[PDB]
Amino acid sequence: EDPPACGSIVPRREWRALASECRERLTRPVRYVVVSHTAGSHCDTPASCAQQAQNVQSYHVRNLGWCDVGYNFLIGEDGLVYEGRGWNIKGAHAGPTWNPISIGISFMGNYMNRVPPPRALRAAQNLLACGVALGALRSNYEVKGHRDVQPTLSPGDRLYEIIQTWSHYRA
Amino acid sequence: EDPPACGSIVPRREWRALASECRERLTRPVRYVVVSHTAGSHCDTPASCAQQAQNVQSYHVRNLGWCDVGYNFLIGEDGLVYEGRGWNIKGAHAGPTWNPISIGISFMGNYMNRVPPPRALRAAQNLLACGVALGALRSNYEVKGHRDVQPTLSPGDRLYEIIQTWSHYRA
Ligand SMILES: CCCCCCCCCCCCCCCC(=O)Oc1ccc([N+](=O)[O-])cc1
């Protein structure tokens, strides 16, 4: 491993994640990033957000039968990025059309009547810049709201409005 | 505005920092990075750590009469980096010898008998990369611990041994 790391990401083990059983890799570089919200409870401390990351992963693995938390990454209102399937593994966030050609990041919480804090927003934007730097993402990658590629309300009305202001957002 | 980002650094305004009156500029790319601990209380949440940066700046400004908090950046156990004097303004952390030829980053707390969490350490190197990425830091920069340049116990026994294993650490 030649390691020149980017950003700060709370690795799987730190948030006590069940080992992954996922195997299908994504093709680098990836062109799309889909932004969703978990629709679950929010957290603003590394302690409560490690917890929530475990909770979301348990729901997906235990109730849905997936190989791993469905998201490649999760964003905490604590301002940290939590590692999901990562940069090289296909997620289960955006359907069978989009899961194979995109990176899915999800903000932990419901943003229909609520906006996430600046640090979460910064954590997300930063991860993406890091994805481009690492070669995992296309320099001209595109960001989509979950609701742009599926019939959901995800990533929440408030959060959707915000990501539409991002330079890489393409409806 | 002012920001399209970087290292997920909490900006001055977000931690409600008094405005700075400092004017001496550092000439990049900067050669050294000095690691210190505040020797103040620690905090592990965005709220408590925003308050703790305010508390440190308050002391430096109102009581020591400094133009702004002396550190270029502060590191909270919440895993975040707090904007201090920044990449361009000379700091007041390591004396007249080192202040003009280095960037000073301080871990908020006393690390003599305590160890800073992995995320705090992550935010630090993540911070230092962001540095190089902007040309704020020297591609091959060197990390020195407070006690390597001044008669002090800073940055603490426990934190000092860790930074001793960093790939850029020097004595
Ligand atoms: C010779 C040893 C190998 C060293 C060469 C490879 C190192 C590449 C390391 C990449 C990881 C750190 C890069 C940080 C990138 C980053 O997020 O900075 C930004 C720079 C600019 C913006 N922006 O949009 O304004 C946002 C972010």
Swiss-Prot record, chains A, B:
Disulfide feature: C6-C130, C22-C67, C43-C49
Gene Ontology CC annotation, any one: extracellular region
SUPFAM superfamilies: N-acetylmuramoyl-L-alanine amidase-like
Keyword Secreted in record: yes
Subunit structure: Homotetramer.
Described purpose of this protein according to its UniProt entry: Innate immunity protein that plays several important functions in antimicrobial and antitumor defense systems. Acts as a pattern receptor that binds to murein peptidoglycans (PGN) of Gram-positive bacteria and thus provides bactericidal activity. Forms an equimolar complex with heat shock protein HSPA1A and induces programmed cell death through apoptosis and necroptosis in tumor cell lines by activating the TNFR1 receptor on the target cell membrane. In addition, acts in complex with the Ca(2+)-binding protein S100A4 as a chemoattractant able to induce lymphocyte movement.
Family: Belongs to the N-acetylmuramoyl-L-alanine amidase 2 family.
Protein name stated in the entry: Peptidoglycan recognition protein 1
Gene that this polypeptide is encoded by: PGLYRP1
Organism: Camelus dromedarius (Dromedary)
GO terms for MF: N-acetylmuramoyl-L-alanine amidase activity; peptidoglycan binding; peptidoglycan immune receptor activity; zinc ion binding
Presence of keyword Disulfide bond: yes
